[PDB]
């Protein structure tokens, strides 16, 4: 088992940039990939980005590709979501997830049901 | 001064086959009869040696290689075999002298919803040499364009989880494997049979 704790959410003006963190503790040696997901009020949970723990290759949903960056610090067992060029459409609760499942195919981490989930952090993007 | 075969065969944790474990046995009496009389094993094949003649032989070292693979791959842990395990994960030499021991570990290594902790190497540019161990995680170029260490189209991570669930057919169930290698170098022969 691992425990995922997210931080860094809050209010930001459109066009700004914010970094979310997710600290992983417990059985950290098991980590194969980390993923970020978001849920806006009244919408289904949506995949944002995934990163392979070994090598750091990243996979992005189309709605954030070119704007968001995912990175991970192995020594600190932390994954980061750098949310650049914030838009009103980015307002949501962001959740980090961990899996020990190793796929040869990075894109599978967009649809894999993960093993453990963070508590969620609210990001609210203000007008103009 | 009994050889610590218990530590090998009764280990709670076993290695992924790509990153197979080797235990060096030395400075002990080896009671091989505890293995070959046991009903705990379903595979017990010895090439160019019989566990009954080991009881009055001395070696400089004995090596016990251990890992998990699925049932259908146990046939690949033999001299002259081909397949993903023999080619990319764990290779025996054509003239192997030693023993291959396996048992079904469904009760330990499978879990409801799937255990994905055991990995294998799915891709490699060339076959392993005998007893070579590759733990590299270089992105594998499957297509005609170089990867430059970035995953994408035709550019794959080389390792893959097995999926062990208790309801799998026996061919897809986890098996624990131990391979015994016997070595005699220019040193005192410190691993002896009870005679
Ligand atoms: C492993 O432990 C069991 C006790 O349940 C015993 O039967 C067996 O001899 C042990 N294996 C070795 C190789 O010592």
């Amino acid at each position: 088992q691992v425990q995922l704790v997210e931080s860094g959410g809050g209010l930001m003006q459109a066009g700004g940039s914010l970094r979310l963190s997710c600290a992983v503790s417990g059985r950290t040696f098991s980590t194969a990939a980390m993923g970020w997901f978001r849920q806006a009020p009244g919408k289904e949970r949506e995949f944002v980005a995934a990163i392979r723990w070994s090598g750091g290759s990243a996979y992005y949903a189309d709605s954030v590709k070119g704007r968001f960056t995912i990175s991970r610090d192995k020594a600190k067992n932390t994954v980061y979501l750098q949310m650049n060029s914030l838009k009103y459409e980015d307002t949501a609760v962001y959740y980090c997830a961990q899996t020990h499942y190793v796929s040869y195919l990075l894109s599978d981490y967009a649809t894999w049901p993960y093993d453990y989930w963070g508590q969620g952090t609210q990001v609210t993007v203000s007008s103009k | 001064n009994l050889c610590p075969f218990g530590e090998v065969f009764n280990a709670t944790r076993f290695a992924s086959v790509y990153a197979w474990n080797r235990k060096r046995i030395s400075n002990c009496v080896a009671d091989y009869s505890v293995l070959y009389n046991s009903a705990s094993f379903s595979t017990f094949k010895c090439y160019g040696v019989s566990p009954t003649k080991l009881n009055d032989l001395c070696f400089t070292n004995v090596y016990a290689d251990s890992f998990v693979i699925r049932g259908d791959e146990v046939r690949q842990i033999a001299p002259g075999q081909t397949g993903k395990i023999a080619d990319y994960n764990y290779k025996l030499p054509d003239d192997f002298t030693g023993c291959v021991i396996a048992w079904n570990s469904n009760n330990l290594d499978s879990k409801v919803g799937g255990n994905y902790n055991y990995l294998y190497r799915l891709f490699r540019k060339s076959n392993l040499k005998p007893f070579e161990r590759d733990i590299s995680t270089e992105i594998y170029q499957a297509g005609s364009t170089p990867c430059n260490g970035v995953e994408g189209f035709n550019c794959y991570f080389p390792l893959q989880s097995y999926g062990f669930q208790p309801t799998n057919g026996v061919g897809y169930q986890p098996y624990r494997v131990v391979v015994l290698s016997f070595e005699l170098l220019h040193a005192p022969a410190t691993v002896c049979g009870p005679k």
Side-chain angles (χ1 to χ4, degrees):
Chain A
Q1 283 198 358
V2 305
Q3 182 178 83
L4 303 202
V5 184
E6 296 105 322
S7 56
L11 190 53
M12 281 305 282
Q13 294 196 16
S17 190
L18 178 55
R19 187 184 196 89
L20 305 181
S21 305
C22 172
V24 185
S25 61
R27 214 173 146 209
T28 50
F29 61 75
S30 71
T31 302
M34 297 300 290
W36 282 95
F37 292 76
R38 72 184 175 184
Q39 193 172 60
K43 308 209 78 190
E44 297 164 38
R45 201 176 55 207
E46 151 189 40
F47 169 75
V48 174
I51 189 165
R52 192 181 301 279
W53 207 247
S54 161
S57 285
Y59 190 78
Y60 298 96
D62 287 7
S63 56
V64 305
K65 196 170 192 197
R67 297 188 298 119
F68 289 12
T69 289
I70 188 179
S71 67
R72 62 92 182 78
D73 177 344
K74 299 184 92 182
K76 277 175 212 308
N77 283 302
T78 303
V79 60
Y80 300 102
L81 181 72
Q82 185 67 48
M83 305 170 75
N84 308 294
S85 304
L86 281 171
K87 302 192 287 186
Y88 184 108
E89 87 177 35
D90 300 317
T91 296
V93 179
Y94 286 70
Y95 295 90
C96 65
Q98 187 266 22
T99 182
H100 62 264
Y101 171 66
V102 179
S103 179
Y104 80 91
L105 187 62
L106 189 67
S107 62
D108 283 344
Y109 293 113
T111 54
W112 191 255
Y114 283 71
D115 295 313
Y116 299 98
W117 287 84
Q119 85 274 19
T121 186
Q122 181 67 52
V123 178
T124 301
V125 180
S126 306
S127 161
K128 294 168 189 191
Chain B
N1 45 26
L2 204 76
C3 294
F5 283 142
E7 294 170 11
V8 174
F9 287 90
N10 291 327
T12 45
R13 172 183 304 271
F14 259 53
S16 291
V17 63
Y18 88 95
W20 49 265
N21 228 256
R22 177 163 283 183
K23 179 49 179 300
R24 174 175 62 187
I25 307 297
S26 76
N27 268 100
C28 57
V29 178
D31 197 10
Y32 296 106
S33 84
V34 169
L35 307 181
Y36 71 71
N37 286 342
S38 173
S40 296
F41 313 121
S42 51
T43 304
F44 204 136
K45 284 198 142 160
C46 303
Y47 297 87
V49 76
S50 87
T52 67
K53 279 154 189 177
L54 293 181
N55 290 331
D56 70 310
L57 285 168
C58 290
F59 296 98
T60 53
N61 283 293
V62 174
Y63 302 100
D65 296 339
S66 60
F67 51 80
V68 172
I69 56 175
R70 64 186 187 91
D72 282 331
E73 299 170 327
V74 169
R75 62 167 169 180
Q76 288 185 42
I77 314 301
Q81 282 292 314
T82 65
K84 279 168 194 178
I85 301 308
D87 292 345
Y88 297 169
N89 290 267
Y90 184 89
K91 182 50 166 177
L92 290 186
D94 282 350
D95 65 335
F96 178 62
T97 306
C99 299
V100 177
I101 298 160
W103 67 98
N104 187 297
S105 54
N106 201 46
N107 55 323
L108 299 172
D109 292 317
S110 294
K111 73 180 150 169
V112 170
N115 174 20
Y116 299 109
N117 291 300
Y118 294 105
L119 310 188
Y120 65 92
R121 187 174 302 277
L122 173 59
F123 298 114
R124 207 178 181 267
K125 294 191 279 182
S126 70
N127 293 346
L128 288 179
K129 304 301 199 198
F131 295 129
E132 173 174 21
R133 190 181 170 257
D134 185 0
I135 64 154
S136 62
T137 56
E138 174 179 35
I139 298 317
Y140 175 77
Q141 179 183 334
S144 54
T145 311
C147 295
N148 308 319
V150 174
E151 291 177 64
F153 287 151
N154 303 310
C155 282
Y156 302 124
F157 196 69
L159 306 184
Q160 172 62 51
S161 295
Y162 284 117
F164 298 128
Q165 292 173 256
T167 60
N168 286 352
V170 67
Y172 284 88
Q173 280 177 24
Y175 282 66
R176 286 176 177 203
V177 183
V178 178
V179 181
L180 299 183
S181 287
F182 300 85
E183 181 170 277
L184 195 74
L185 303 181
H186 300 271
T190 182
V191 182
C192 291
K195 289 279 143 42

Coordinates of all heavy atoms in Angstrom, one line a residue, chain B residues 5-7 9-10 34-35 38 40-41, ligand 1:
Chain B
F5 N 19.8 -23.8 2.4 CA 18.8 -24.0 1.4 C 17.4 -23.5 1.8 O 16.7 -23.1 0.9 CB 18.6 -25.5 1.1 CG 19.7 -26.1 0.3 CD1 20.1 -27.4 0.5 CD2 20.3 -25.4 -0.8 CE1 21.1 -28.0 -0.2 CE2 21.3 -26.0 -1.5 CZ 21.7 -27.3 -1.3
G6 N 17.1 -23.6 3.1 CA 15.8 -23.0 3.6 C 15.6 -21.6 3.2 O 14.5 -21.2 2.8
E7 N 16.7 -20.7 3.3 CA 16.7 -19.3 2.9 C 16.3 -19.2 1.5 O 15.7 -18.2 1.1 CB 18.0 -18.6 3.2 CG 18.4 -18.5 4.7 CD 19.8 -18.1 5.0 OE1 20.5 -17.6 4.1 OE2 20.2 -18.2 6.2
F9 N 14.7 -21.7 -0.8 CA 13.4 -22.4 -1.2 C 12.2 -21.9 -0.4 O 11.2 -21.8 -1.0 CB 13.6 -23.9 -1.0 CG 14.5 -24.5 -2.1 CD1 15.8 -24.7 -1.9 CD2 13.9 -25.0 -3.3 CE1 16.6 -25.2 -2.9 CE2 14.7 -25.6 -4.3 CZ 16.1 -25.6 -4.1
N10 N 12.4 -21.4 0.9 CA 11.3 -20.9 1.7 C 11.4 -19.4 1.8 O 10.7 -18.9 2.7 CB 11.3 -21.6 3.1 CG 11.0 -23.1 3.1 OD1 10.2 -23.5 2.3 ND2 11.6 -23.8 3.9
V34 N 17.1 -33.7 1.3 CA 16.0 -32.8 1.8 C 15.2 -32.3 0.6 O 14.0 -32.1 0.7 CB 16.5 -31.7 2.7 CG1 15.4 -30.7 3.0 CG2 17.0 -32.3 4.0
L35 N 15.9 -32.1 -0.6 CA 15.3 -31.6 -1.8 C 14.7 -32.7 -2.6 O 13.5 -32.6 -2.9 CB 16.3 -30.8 -2.6 CG 17.1 -29.7 -1.9 CD1 18.0 -29.0 -2.9 CD2 16.1 -28.6 -1.3
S38 N 11.6 -34.6 -1.3 CA 10.5 -33.7 -0.9 C 9.4 -33.9 -1.9 O 9.7 -34.0 -3.1 CB 11.0 -32.3 -0.9 OG 9.8 -31.4 -0.7
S40 N 7.3 -31.3 -2.3 CA 7.0 -29.9 -2.5 C 7.2 -29.5 -4.0 O 6.8 -28.4 -4.3 CB 7.8 -29.0 -1.6 OG 7.5 -29.3 -0.3
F41 N 8.0 -30.3 -4.8 CA 8.4 -29.9 -6.2 C 7.7 -30.7 -7.3 O 7.5 -31.9 -7.1 CB 9.9 -30.0 -6.4 CG 10.7 -29.4 -5.2 CD1 11.5 -30.1 -4.5 CD2 10.5 -28.0 -4.9 CE1 12.2 -29.5 -3.4 CE2 11.2 -27.4 -3.9 CZ 12.1 -28.2 -3.1
Ligands
LIG1 C1 11.2 -25.2 4.0 O1 10.4 -25.3 5.1 C2 9.6 -26.5 5.2 C3 8.8 -26.5 6.5 O2 7.5 -26.3 6.2 C4 10.5 -27.8 5.1 O3 9.6 -28.9 4.8 C5 11.6 -27.7 4.1 O4 12.6 -28.7 4.3 C6 12.3 -26.3 4.0 N1 13.1 -26.3 2.9 C7 14.5 -26.4 2.9 C8 15.1 -26.6 1.6 O5 15.1 -26.4 4.0

